[PDB]
Amino acid sequence: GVMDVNTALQEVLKTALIHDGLARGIREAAKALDKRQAHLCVLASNCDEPMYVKLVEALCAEHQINLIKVDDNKKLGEWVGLCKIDREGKPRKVVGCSCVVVKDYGKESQAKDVIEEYFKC
RNA sequence: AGGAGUGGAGCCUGCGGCUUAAUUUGACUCAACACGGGAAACCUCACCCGGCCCGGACACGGACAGGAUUGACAGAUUGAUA
């Protein structure tokens, strides 16, 4: 029923992870942005380094790509598969670019659609 | 009974000794010594002098979105576009 951003993001990030995409970390996410292979950016909050977040806003703005501002980067690490080991490990991933469409070539779920619906307004 | 011999010469080969950084070593009566199919330039390769590589699965902990991987130049190689 309800598919708010904070629950469709997990679905879209996972579904991308099965089908490549998901450029994790500031490096290679900046590469996806400059190379213009990106379709969605997920910047995490509570990032101490101001230059980090400011530069990723700059990249997204100039490249005209949507930007999601989630909190608790560790949760982003869970979502993008950085955790592994059941539910242990958990490195922070405070930025991620969803290459080859917001969704992936495997499936086109409506959870992808809610993202663009929320971004249109 | 004899034939061809060889042991003598020079050379080719295997063995010991000597030598050497190293002259890798197995096998000393028949039943070791042109034997290991052993005619070694490299390779072979075991030996000697130098120098790269991990091709140290996997399990458990650290570190980690930057763990870690290549690398052009000049030095340097106390040999090399290592």
PDB file of C-alpha atoms (C1' of nucleotides) in Angstrom:
ATOM      1  CA  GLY A   1       0.000   0.000   0.000  1.00  0.00           C
ATOM      2  CA  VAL A   2       2.019   2.927   1.327  1.00  0.00           C
ATOM      3  CA  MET A   3       5.441   3.070  -0.340  1.00  0.00           C
ATOM      4  CA  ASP A   4       7.041   6.220   1.101  1.00  0.00           C
ATOM      5  CA  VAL A   5      10.565   7.186   0.022  1.00  0.00           C
ATOM      6  CA  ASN A   6      12.266   5.690   3.092  1.00  0.00           C
ATOM      7  CA  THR A   7      10.920   2.223   2.232  1.00  0.00           C
ATOM      8  CA  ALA A   8      11.060   2.288  -1.576  1.00  0.00           C
ATOM      9  CA  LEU A   9      14.716   3.354  -1.354  1.00  0.00           C
ATOM     10  CA  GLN A  10      15.693   0.010   0.171  1.00  0.00           C
ATOM     11  CA  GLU A  11      13.842  -1.860  -2.574  1.00  0.00           C
ATOM     12  CA  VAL A  12      15.345   0.158  -5.419  1.00  0.00           C
ATOM     13  CA  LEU A  13      18.887   0.031  -4.014  1.00  0.00           C
ATOM     14  CA  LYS A  14      18.709  -3.732  -3.466  1.00  0.00           C
ATOM     15  CA  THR A  15      17.163  -4.381  -6.874  1.00  0.00           C
ATOM     16  CA  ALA A  16      19.953  -2.339  -8.444  1.00  0.00           C
ATOM     17  CA  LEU A  17      22.509  -4.281  -6.398  1.00  0.00           C
ATOM     18  CA  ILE A  18      21.400  -7.559  -7.981  1.00  0.00           C
ATOM     19  CA  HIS A  19      21.786  -5.842 -11.350  1.00  0.00           C
ATOM     20  CA  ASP A  20      25.084  -3.958 -10.903  1.00  0.00           C
ATOM     21  CA  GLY A  21      24.687  -0.182 -10.580  1.00  0.00           C
ATOM     22  CA  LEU A  22      25.047   1.321  -7.093  1.00  0.00           C
ATOM     23  CA  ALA A  23      28.323   3.206  -7.370  1.00  0.00           C
ATOM     24  CA  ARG A  24      29.278   3.345  -3.689  1.00  0.00           C
ATOM     25  CA  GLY A  25      31.580   5.885  -2.073  1.00  0.00           C
ATOM     26  CA  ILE A  26      32.587   9.380  -3.149  1.00  0.00           C
ATOM     27  CA  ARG A  27      34.961   7.946  -5.726  1.00  0.00           C
ATOM     28  CA  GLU A  28      33.321   6.241  -8.729  1.00  0.00           C
ATOM     29  CA  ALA A  29      30.158   8.061  -7.727  1.00  0.00           C
ATOM     30  CA  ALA A  30      31.847  11.266  -8.795  1.00  0.00           C
ATOM     31  CA  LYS A  31      32.949   9.196 -11.798  1.00  0.00           C
ATOM     32  CA  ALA A  32      29.361   8.178 -12.578  1.00  0.00           C
ATOM     33  CA  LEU A  33      28.248  11.803 -12.232  1.00  0.00           C
ATOM     34  CA  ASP A  34      31.001  13.263 -14.431  1.00  0.00           C
ATOM     35  CA  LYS A  35      30.627  10.430 -16.955  1.00  0.00           C
ATOM     36  CA  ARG A  36      26.846  11.084 -16.833  1.00  0.00           C
ATOM     37  CA  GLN A  37      25.969   7.442 -16.170  1.00  0.00           C
ATOM     38  CA  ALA A  38      24.040   8.348 -13.013  1.00  0.00           C
ATOM     39  CA  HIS A  39      20.274   8.480 -12.579  1.00  0.00           C
ATOM     40  CA  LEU A  40      19.849   8.940  -8.813  1.00  0.00           C
ATOM     41  CA  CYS A  41      22.054  10.035  -5.927  1.00  0.00           C
ATOM     42  CA  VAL A  42      21.622   9.092  -2.267  1.00  0.00           C
ATOM     43  CA  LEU A  43      23.620  11.367   0.039  1.00  0.00           C
ATOM     44  CA  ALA A  44      23.514  10.477   3.718  1.00  0.00           C
ATOM     45  CA  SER A  45      23.164  13.045   6.487  1.00  0.00           C
ATOM     46  CA  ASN A  46      25.255  13.404   9.681  1.00  0.00           C
ATOM     47  CA  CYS A  47      28.388  13.684   7.523  1.00  0.00           C
ATOM     48  CA  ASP A  48      30.950  15.633   9.534  1.00  0.00           C
ATOM     49  CA  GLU A  49      33.029  16.801   6.561  1.00  0.00           C
ATOM     50  CA  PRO A  50      31.175  19.819   5.093  1.00  0.00           C
ATOM     51  CA  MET A  51      33.236  19.794   1.895  1.00  0.00           C
ATOM     52  CA  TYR A  52      32.047  16.240   1.186  1.00  0.00           C
ATOM     53  CA  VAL A  53      28.331  17.035   1.207  1.00  0.00           C
ATOM     54  CA  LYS A  54      28.842  20.416  -0.446  1.00  0.00           C
ATOM     55  CA  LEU A  55      30.791  18.880  -3.330  1.00  0.00           C
ATOM     56  CA  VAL A  56      28.199  16.161  -3.867  1.00  0.00           C
ATOM     57  CA  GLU A  57      25.403  18.763  -4.000  1.00  0.00           C
ATOM     58  CA  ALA A  58      27.537  20.661  -6.514  1.00  0.00           C
ATOM     59  CA  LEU A  59      27.982  17.572  -8.681  1.00  0.00           C
ATOM     60  CA  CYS A  60      24.286  16.679  -8.563  1.00  0.00           C
ATOM     61  CA  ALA A  61      23.194  20.252  -9.293  1.00  0.00           C
ATOM     62  CA  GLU A  62      25.481  20.819 -12.272  1.00  0.00           C
ATOM     63  CA  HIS A  63      24.750  17.370 -13.689  1.00  0.00           C
ATOM     64  CA  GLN A  64      20.994  17.873 -13.089  1.00  0.00           C
ATOM     65  CA  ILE A  65      20.483  14.616 -11.192  1.00  0.00           C
ATOM     66  CA  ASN A  66      18.069  14.011  -8.330  1.00  0.00           C
ATOM     67  CA  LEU A  67      19.474  13.847  -4.795  1.00  0.00           C
ATOM     68  CA  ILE A  68      17.992  11.993  -1.808  1.00  0.00           C
ATOM     69  CA  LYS A  69      19.103  13.102   1.665  1.00  0.00           C
ATOM     70  CA  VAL A  70      18.820  10.125   4.025  1.00  0.00           C
ATOM     71  CA  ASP A  71      20.194  10.041   7.576  1.00  0.00           C
ATOM     72  CA  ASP A  72      22.326   7.521   9.491  1.00  0.00           C
ATOM     73  CA  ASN A  73      24.802   6.566   6.753  1.00  0.00           C
ATOM     74  CA  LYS A  74      25.156   3.177   8.441  1.00  0.00           C
ATOM     75  CA  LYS A  75      21.595   2.447   7.323  1.00  0.00           C
ATOM     76  CA  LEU A  76      22.654   3.328   3.782  1.00  0.00           C
ATOM     77  CA  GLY A  77      25.476   0.830   4.229  1.00  0.00           C
ATOM     78  CA  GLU A  78      22.944  -1.833   5.165  1.00  0.00           C
ATOM     79  CA  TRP A  79      20.780  -0.934   2.174  1.00  0.00           C
ATOM     80  CA  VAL A  80      23.589  -1.031  -0.405  1.00  0.00           C
ATOM     81  CA  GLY A  81      24.909  -4.374   0.842  1.00  0.00           C
ATOM     82  CA  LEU A  82      28.070  -3.057   2.500  1.00  0.00           C
ATOM     83  CA  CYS A  83      27.104  -4.836   5.729  1.00  0.00           C
ATOM     84  CA  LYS A  84      27.055  -8.499   4.628  1.00  0.00           C
ATOM     85  CA  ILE A  85      27.974 -11.075   7.319  1.00  0.00           C
ATOM     86  CA  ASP A  86      24.346 -11.559   8.385  1.00  0.00           C
ATOM     87  CA  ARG A  87      23.877  -8.080   9.881  1.00  0.00           C
ATOM     88  CA  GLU A  88      27.437  -7.260  10.992  1.00  0.00           C
ATOM     89  CA  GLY A  89      30.271  -5.256   9.503  1.00  0.00           C
ATOM     90  CA  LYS A  90      28.387  -2.133   8.434  1.00  0.00           C
ATOM     91  CA  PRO A  91      30.747   0.427   6.881  1.00  0.00           C
ATOM     92  CA  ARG A  92      29.240   3.869   6.288  1.00  0.00           C
ATOM     93  CA  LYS A  93      28.354   4.751   2.689  1.00  0.00           C
ATOM     94  CA  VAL A  94      27.341   8.407   2.644  1.00  0.00           C
ATOM     95  CA  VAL A  95      26.886   8.636  -1.129  1.00  0.00           C
ATOM     96  CA  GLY A  96      25.674   6.320  -3.878  1.00  0.00           C
ATOM     97  CA  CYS A  97      24.773   6.678  -7.548  1.00  0.00           C
ATOM     98  CA  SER A  98      22.251   4.333  -9.168  1.00  0.00           C
ATOM     99  CA  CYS A  99      23.754   3.664 -12.586  1.00  0.00           C
ATOM    100  CA  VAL A 100      21.750   2.342 -15.565  1.00  0.00           C
ATOM    101  CA  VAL A 101      18.356   3.887 -14.662  1.00  0.00           C
ATOM    102  CA  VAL A 102      17.073   4.491 -11.124  1.00  0.00           C
ATOM    103  CA  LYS A 103      15.844   0.918 -11.382  1.00  0.00           C
ATOM    104  CA  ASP A 104      17.746  -1.723 -13.343  1.00  0.00           C
ATOM    105  CA  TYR A 105      17.335  -3.744 -16.523  1.00  0.00           C
ATOM    106  CA  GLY A 106      16.133  -6.763 -14.530  1.00  0.00           C
ATOM    107  CA  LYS A 107      12.808  -5.460 -13.232  1.00  0.00           C
ATOM    108  CA  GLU A 108      10.874  -2.186 -13.299  1.00  0.00           C
ATOM    109  CA  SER A 109       9.110  -2.106  -9.945  1.00  0.00           C
ATOM    110  CA  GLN A 110       6.632   0.569  -8.929  1.00  0.00           C
ATOM    111  CA  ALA A 111       8.932   1.304  -5.980  1.00  0.00           C
ATOM    112  CA  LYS A 112      11.143   2.920  -8.608  1.00  0.00           C
ATOM    113  CA  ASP A 113       8.114   4.893  -9.786  1.00  0.00           C
ATOM    114  CA  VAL A 114       7.406   6.380  -6.357  1.00  0.00           C
ATOM    115  CA  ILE A 115      10.900   7.896  -6.420  1.00  0.00           C
ATOM    116  CA  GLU A 116      10.252   9.898  -9.582  1.00  0.00           C
ATOM    117  CA  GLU A 117       6.726  10.717  -8.397  1.00  0.00           C
ATOM    118  CA  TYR A 118       8.173  12.216  -5.212  1.00  0.00           C
ATOM    119  CA  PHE A 119      10.937  13.993  -7.141  1.00  0.00           C
ATOM    120  CA  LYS A 120       8.577  15.564  -9.700  1.00  0.00           C
ATOM    121  CA  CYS A 121       7.016  17.796  -7.037  1.00  0.00           C
TER     122      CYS A 121
ATOM    123  C1'   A B   1      91.278 -75.037 -31.244  1.00  0.00           C
ATOM    124  C1'   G B   2      91.298 -70.576 -33.036  1.00  0.00           C
ATOM    125  C1'   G B   3      89.253 -65.671 -35.013  1.00  0.00           C
ATOM    126  C1'   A B   4      88.695 -60.356 -33.873  1.00  0.00           C
ATOM    127  C1'   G B   5      90.718 -58.113 -30.465  1.00  0.00           C
ATOM    128  C1'   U B   6      92.257 -54.314 -26.042  1.00  0.00           C
ATOM    129  C1'   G B   7      95.720 -53.445 -22.291  1.00  0.00           C
ATOM    130  C1'   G B   8     100.344 -49.542 -25.847  1.00  0.00           C
ATOM    131  C1'   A B   9      99.132 -43.993 -29.505  1.00  0.00           C
ATOM    132  C1'   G B  10      95.894 -39.815 -30.449  1.00  0.00           C
ATOM    133  C1'   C B  11      91.085 -38.383 -29.854  1.00  0.00           C
ATOM    134  C1'   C B  12      85.626 -39.091 -27.970  1.00  0.00           C
ATOM    135  C1'   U B  13      83.038 -40.384 -23.810  1.00  0.00           C
ATOM    136  C1'   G B  14      81.676 -42.163 -18.378  1.00  0.00           C
ATOM    137  C1'   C B  15      84.231 -42.621 -13.051  1.00  0.00           C
ATOM    138  C1'   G B  16      87.594 -41.130  -9.244  1.00  0.00           C
ATOM    139  C1'   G B  17      91.127 -37.378  -7.614  1.00  0.00           C
ATOM    140  C1'   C B  18      92.487 -32.296  -7.990  1.00  0.00           C
ATOM    141  C1'   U B  19      90.420 -27.567  -8.631  1.00  0.00           C
ATOM    142  C1'   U B  20      86.223 -24.357  -7.769  1.00  0.00           C
ATOM    143  C1'   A B  21      81.468 -19.481  -6.027  1.00  0.00           C
ATOM    144  C1'   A B  22      79.674 -23.830  -7.899  1.00  0.00           C
ATOM    145  C1'   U B  23      82.097 -27.719 -10.677  1.00  0.00           C
ATOM    146  C1'   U B  24      74.028 -30.864  -8.606  1.00  0.00           C
ATOM    147  C1'   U B  25      74.247 -36.517  -7.738  1.00  0.00           C
ATOM    148  C1'   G B  26      72.491 -41.638  -7.989  1.00  0.00           C
ATOM    149  C1'   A B  27      74.940 -46.148  -8.713  1.00  0.00           C
ATOM    150  C1'   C B  28      81.420 -49.142  -6.689  1.00  0.00           C
ATOM    151  C1'   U B  29      82.945 -57.247  -8.401  1.00  0.00           C
ATOM    152  C1'   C B  30      80.044 -60.263 -11.797  1.00  0.00           C
ATOM    153  C1'   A B  31      74.852 -57.593 -10.008  1.00  0.00           C
ATOM    154  C1'   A B  32      78.683 -49.115 -10.815  1.00  0.00           C
ATOM    155  C1'   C B  33      81.863 -46.614 -14.622  1.00  0.00           C
ATOM    156  C1'   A B  34      78.559 -44.374 -24.060  1.00  0.00           C
ATOM    157  C1'   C B  35      74.347 -46.342 -17.048  1.00  0.00           C
ATOM    158  C1'   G B  36      69.999 -43.015 -15.039  1.00  0.00           C
ATOM    159  C1'   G B  37      67.486 -43.577 -22.043  1.00  0.00           C
ATOM    160  C1'   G B  38      72.301 -38.596 -18.639  1.00  0.00           C
ATOM    161  C1'   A B  39      74.392 -35.997 -26.913  1.00  0.00           C
ATOM    162  C1'   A B  40      73.517 -29.803 -20.138  1.00  0.00           C
ATOM    163  C1'   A B  41      74.729 -22.951 -24.868  1.00  0.00           C
ATOM    164  C1'   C B  42      69.287 -20.879 -22.494  1.00  0.00           C
ATOM    165  C1'   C B  43      65.417 -24.403 -20.974  1.00  0.00           C
ATOM    166  C1'   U B  44      66.459 -28.753 -18.883  1.00  0.00           C
ATOM    167  C1'   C B  45      68.519 -27.979 -13.288  1.00  0.00           C
ATOM    168  C1'   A B  46      68.884 -30.341  -9.104  1.00  0.00           C
ATOM    169  C1'   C B  47      74.590 -26.622  -7.950  1.00  0.00           C
ATOM    170  C1'   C B  48      76.684 -21.128  -7.333  1.00  0.00           C
ATOM    171  C1'   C B  49      75.998 -15.476  -7.425  1.00  0.00           C
ATOM    172  C1'   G B  50      72.220 -11.843  -7.637  1.00  0.00           C
ATOM    173  C1'   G B  51      66.791 -10.179  -8.235  1.00  0.00           C
ATOM    174  C1'   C B  52      61.101 -10.110  -8.990  1.00  0.00           C
ATOM    175  C1'   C B  53      56.320 -13.198  -7.629  1.00  0.00           C
ATOM    176  C1'   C B  54      52.594 -15.824  -4.132  1.00  0.00           C
ATOM    177  C1'   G B  55      50.245 -19.343  -7.647  1.00  0.00           C
ATOM    178  C1'   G B  56      50.298 -18.306   1.753  1.00  0.00           C
ATOM    179  C1'   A B  57      43.053 -22.516  -0.018  1.00  0.00           C
ATOM    180  C1'   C B  58      39.507 -21.925   4.304  1.00  0.00           C
ATOM    181  C1'   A B  59      38.129 -20.332   9.345  1.00  0.00           C
ATOM    182  C1'   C B  60      38.436 -16.662  13.195  1.00  0.00           C
ATOM    183  C1'   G B  61      39.441 -11.522  14.607  1.00  0.00           C
ATOM    184  C1'   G B  62      41.390  -6.185  12.927  1.00  0.00           C
ATOM    185  C1'   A B  63      41.293  -2.390   9.052  1.00  0.00           C
ATOM    186  C1'   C B  64      37.587  -0.933   5.257  1.00  0.00           C
ATOM    187  C1'   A B  65      34.471   3.367   1.191  1.00  0.00           C
ATOM    188  C1'   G B  66      38.192   3.873   0.531  1.00  0.00           C
ATOM    189  C1'   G B  67      40.612  -2.637   2.226  1.00  0.00           C
ATOM    190  C1'   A B  68      43.642  -2.867  -1.381  1.00  0.00           C
ATOM    191  C1'   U B  69      45.626  -2.959  -7.273  1.00  0.00           C
ATOM    192  C1'   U B  70      48.521  -1.102 -11.445  1.00  0.00           C
ATOM    193  C1'   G B  71      51.568   2.313 -12.991  1.00  0.00           C
ATOM    194  C1'   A B  72      54.370   6.896 -17.099  1.00  0.00           C
ATOM    195  C1'   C B  73      59.323  10.219 -15.287  1.00  0.00           C
ATOM    196  C1'   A B  74      63.821  11.017 -12.897  1.00  0.00           C
ATOM    197  C1'   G B  75      66.878   8.246  -9.485  1.00  0.00           C
ATOM    198  C1'   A B  76      68.232   3.367  -8.998  1.00  0.00           C
ATOM    199  C1'   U B  77      69.396  -1.578 -11.133  1.00  0.00           C
ATOM    200  C1'   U B  78      75.363  -1.855  -6.957  1.00  0.00           C
ATOM    201  C1'   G B  79      72.452  -6.653 -14.853  1.00  0.00           C
ATOM    202  C1'   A B  80      66.966  -5.378 -17.113  1.00  0.00           C
ATOM    203  C1'   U B  81      61.505  -1.312 -20.302  1.00  0.00           C
ATOM    204  C1'   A B  82      61.956  -5.294 -12.099  1.00  0.00           C
TER     205        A B  82
END
